[PDB]
Structures are given as C-alpha cells and as structure tokens.
A paper describes a structure:
NoVs recognize specific glycan ligands as host attachment factors or receptors for infection. Genogroup II (GII) noroviruses consist of human noroviruses (huNoVs) that generally bind histo-blood group antigens (HBGAs) as host factors and three porcine norovirus (porNoV) genotypes (GII.11/18/19) that form a genetic lineage lacking HBGA-binding ability. In this study, we solved the P protein crystal structures of a GII.11 porNoV (VA34) that was isolated from pig caecum contents in 1997 in Japan and a close-related GII.3 huNoV (TV24) that was isolated in 1977 in the USA, representing one of the earliest huNoV isolates, focusing on their HBSs compared with the previously known ones.
In contrast, the porNoV VA34 P protein did not bind these saliva samples (OD < 0.1) and it did not bind the oligosaccharides representing A, B, and H antigens either (OD < 0.1). Although 10 oligosaccharides representing various HBGAs and a ganglioside were used to co-crystallize with the VA34 P proteins individually, no extra electron density was seen other than the native P protein, consistent with the negative results of HBGA binding assay and glycan array screening. However, the sequence compositions and the structure of the VA34 site corresponding to the HBSs of the TV24 and other GII huNoVs appeared to be conserved (Figures 4 and 7(A and B)), indicating that this site of VA34 is under functional selection over time during evolution. The primary variations in both sequences and structures between the two P proteins are at the surface loops between β-strands, mainly in the P2 subdomains that form the top surface of the viral protrusions, most likely contributing to the differences in their antigenicity and HBSs. VA34 P protein represents the first solved P protein structure of a GII porNoV.
Residue numbers in the entry:
A (entry chain A): 225 to 296, 306 to 540
B (entry chain B): 224 to 296, 306 to 540
The structure:
Amino acid sequence: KPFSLPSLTLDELSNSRFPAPIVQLYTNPHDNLVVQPQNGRCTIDGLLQGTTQLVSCNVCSFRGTLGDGQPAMAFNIQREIMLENLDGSPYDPTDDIPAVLGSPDFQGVVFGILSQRNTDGQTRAHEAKVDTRLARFAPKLGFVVATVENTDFHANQPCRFTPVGLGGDNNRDFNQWGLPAYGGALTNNTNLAPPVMPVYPGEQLLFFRSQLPSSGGVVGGWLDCLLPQEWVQHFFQESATSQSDVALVRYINPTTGRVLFEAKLHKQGFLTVAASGSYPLVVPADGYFRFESWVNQFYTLAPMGNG
Amino acid sequence: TKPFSLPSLTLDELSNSRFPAPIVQLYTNPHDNLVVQPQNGRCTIDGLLQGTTQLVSCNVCSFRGTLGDGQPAMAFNIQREIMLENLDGSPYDPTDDIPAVLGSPDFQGVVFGILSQRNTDGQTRAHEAKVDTRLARFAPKLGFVVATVENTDFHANQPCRFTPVGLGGDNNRDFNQWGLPAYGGALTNNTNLAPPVMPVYPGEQLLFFRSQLPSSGGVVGGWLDCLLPQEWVQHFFQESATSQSDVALVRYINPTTGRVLFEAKLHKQGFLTVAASGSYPLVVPADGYFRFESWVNQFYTLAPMGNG
C-alpha cells in the first residue's frame, strides 16, 4: 500500500492507447487542445476510467459477429460488426462507459486484420480498415463498420479485428486528440474520463509516445498516452492510497544513477513537466522513472531542458 | 529479504507470453513424447529471463529490419528477405548468448500478419504477409528471415516491421507449437536455449496458460500454451524476489465465493504443475485468480485437480 511505479524502462513499456512499444517521451503545449483520451486512463490509486481495460493486446481490437457485405479506394466493401465484449460475453450498451472497452479513442482509420473462425471451425483472415469517423462507427450502441477489399468473408459468423496501425491516406486522416462520436454521427459522448491539463502555469503534459505503422501516405503515426499499459495494470493491482494530489517522480540515467529530470505524476493519472515547446526528450531509452515523494500543486519543478 | 508475490490480475486480464493474444483457458496434458521447451515466456520466479524472452508484450513474434527485393516462390508467392535489427531498432548482434533475435517465434508454423514500411522519406505502405518459421532461410539467429507476400507494393532497401496477428498455414499439421524452429537455418543446431520443463513429482502434469490464435485458412485450432503469462514475466523481472524454495504453492480462487478451486506448484524455473491426468481445459471462472500460499518442497502432494 505504499505507492510505487513499475521499474520497467522506457523501452520495456507499451502504449495504453494502441498495442505499440513506447519509443519516446514527448512534450508539447496544451494550447487549443482538449486532451481527453479514453484508453490508458487510470488514477494512480487504481480507478480505471473511460474505455480502459487491462489486456494489452486488446486495445483497439473489436470482436463480434460479421454481417453481409455492401458496396461503399481498393477497400470498397463495407461489413458491419455487431460487437461483443472482448472476452466474448454479451455487450451491454447501458454500462457506465463511453463505448465497448478497448474501442479506439481517436478519429482515424485503424488498419489491421479481420479474422474469422466459423461455428464449424473454418477460418479466414484478411486486411481490413475501421474508420472511426464514419457515421456508423457506434461502439457505444455496439456496431462498427469494417471496410475491406477481399470478398472472402462469411456473414453471420464470428470475427475479430486485430489492429496493426493506421489506414488513412495522410496526416489529416488521423487526429489523435479528437474523440470519435462513440454513439454514431450527431450523438453526444457519455461516461468520459475527464480532460487533463497542467495546473501550474508554464507546465506541459509529458506523454509516452509510440509511432504506428501506416498503410499509405506520408503519415507520422505518432500516438501519445498518459500512462503506459503497464502503469495502468500496476495502479489497478496496487490501488495504493494517494497521500496528496501530486507524486513527484524522477527519471534516472541507468548508467550513472543520476537524475535526468523531474516530473509531477498527478493523481488523475498523467505527468507534467516544466518545459516549453513541442519536442521528444533526449534521454536514454533504458532510463526509468522513480517515485520520490508526495508534494503539492505549488511544487516548482526543475526546468526539463532537452531531458 | 524480498518477499514473493504474484500479480493479482485475473485469468481474463492476462495475455500470452508466446504471442500477443489474451489468455482464454488454463490447460493441462501429459508430457509423454513432448519436449516442452518454449523460448518465449521464459522467466524464473526470481526474475531471470531466458531464451528469446523480452518484456514488450506487443513485440512477441514481431520482426523488424530492412526489406529486400522480391523473388518468386499460391496467392502468397513472392518472397522477400528481412535483414533483422533488434526490436528497438539497434543493430542485431548474431553473437549474443541467445537462440535468436529477441521476440522471434519459438514454434514451427506460419505466422500471418502485416508487413509495414515507413521509408526514409516518410512514405508508408502495409500489406498482408506470412513468415514460415520452418523455411530453410528462417534464420533469425543469423539475422535473416523470409516473408512471403501476395502484394507487389513493397520497397526494397527500406525499413519494415512485421506485426503478427495469427497463423497462416492451411491445416493443423502446419502448426507444431512445441517444435522449435531451426533458428540458424536448415541443418543448423540451436544454441542458448532455455531448458526443457517437466513435472518432477510422478503423475503430475504441466498447467499452461492457453490462447487461441486467429487463422487465415483451414480448420485450425490455433491453440498456444505458455508457461507464464506476459504479466507474470514482467512482474518477476521487476520484483526479482527471493525464492525461499524451488516450489511455491499457489491456489486458484473462485472470485464469487473465495473458495479454493485447485492447488498448483509454481516451480522456480518458471512453470506450473498440477495433480491431474489427461488432456483438457480446466472448467474454472475466467475471472478467477492465483494466490501465492507458501513455500513448499518437491515432495509436497497436491490435491487432485479434477476438472478444476
């Protein structure tokens, strides 16, 4: 019940908003952004929020029953997935969540594989895209549309969508901080984990950053999470009582043992730093965060610099 | 000096250490005529990784490197070599004390997935691909594997990443989960292997954390057993707790009643055994969980498992 962090190094962690390794720490100003992801939301005393669930390989997956194909770009056949929960139990659209757990929490096209294993055991699997911006992207209601090129799919049989990366044509097709309309076009999102922002003037959010694969275009594919998936799992299991609203943490150089920078880990489940501008930190990827002490919101962090 | 513990994640909160897939069952079978020697998901309960085991869940069975030119040889009928890097993009050292590049598949089969690229100029593409671990040129110890593709839209001498999704064979005989690939290529001897595992108490059987993989063709079961889930591997690595004996007694608990459903031994080498006979999935709640009970010795007699 004393608070703790996992000791996994930066390059041992994975993203909580997509199954991808963490490759960088990244900071930027929060001006004209609402930062309100729904995956990778866990308070540091262990309360999961939004669409956050614990299975790393399930983030941005879908599972359910595949419907008939209809027309309408090689990916020009649309098939609906009537969703289940990721464990195969019936999805309850009335649960106090924004959408089926694991649903993507960004506007974009997820590229991956749609696989099937029929009731008789016959299997198939092919490329597929799930466009989270579509009017019929409605995982709160329990329906999404998959777009495919291949005609070899069976209606009224189980399916699983395994995400691999992005499937748009350019950077404008991917808006990582824009939430989808989970209930479909022209509906209001519900049960959202709240937005996050620095409270101390001059501070910026610090993200754990991945770079996703992409099926087309000159696409950066950068995806920021508030906490890596292992920190989410750790806080959930530990459920340590938060002695204040701010845990001071320090990032350590593994060679020297020297502190490289300080950050605040806020109780709501995100980091801030004393930095200005938009950049990836220059720090050893085999460094790691160490919990130091409980402080208050007036604590002044040492300037981060480049890291 | 450092007390032992298990993660408190339930069965349906865990993932496989030999492939990125959820754990769906606990499974037991006799070890007769099997050498059980997986190389992923190998961690001693005091935190020593072995074989090709690494800590990133989404990297298990992935490959990374530079894609080569296409050659012929039936939809997946173009072959392209991947010259491998480590999964973090650092240069792969074929002389490290490991069986193959960390994360390499540890079974004979065809891995179906996506081969993606981001060129030096930023242009991207990604398409279906298969990696057949039985091929003569499957040689991740040397640092080369062959990807088979249908799509002609790939660029040679540009970076690539293979993300595994499931199996890509045509039938159950194309997948042999306990058969190791020849990591150095055809007609070469494997090195630096995590050792085989087996029950020592007569009559006991291994207990596995089991997943079911997707498949691109055939009536394929896709069942994959690991010795420890990926989260236990991460936990033991971080904790590196003192093993007071070679055998930790653990019990699987019903979350509704709090009742013990069955007992198992968690051996220091990093695997479970049970007092059971035959080949079957346990009938237990998927939201149950293991609880560490005490340190015992190899003579401890487990209560019969039954169905679970």
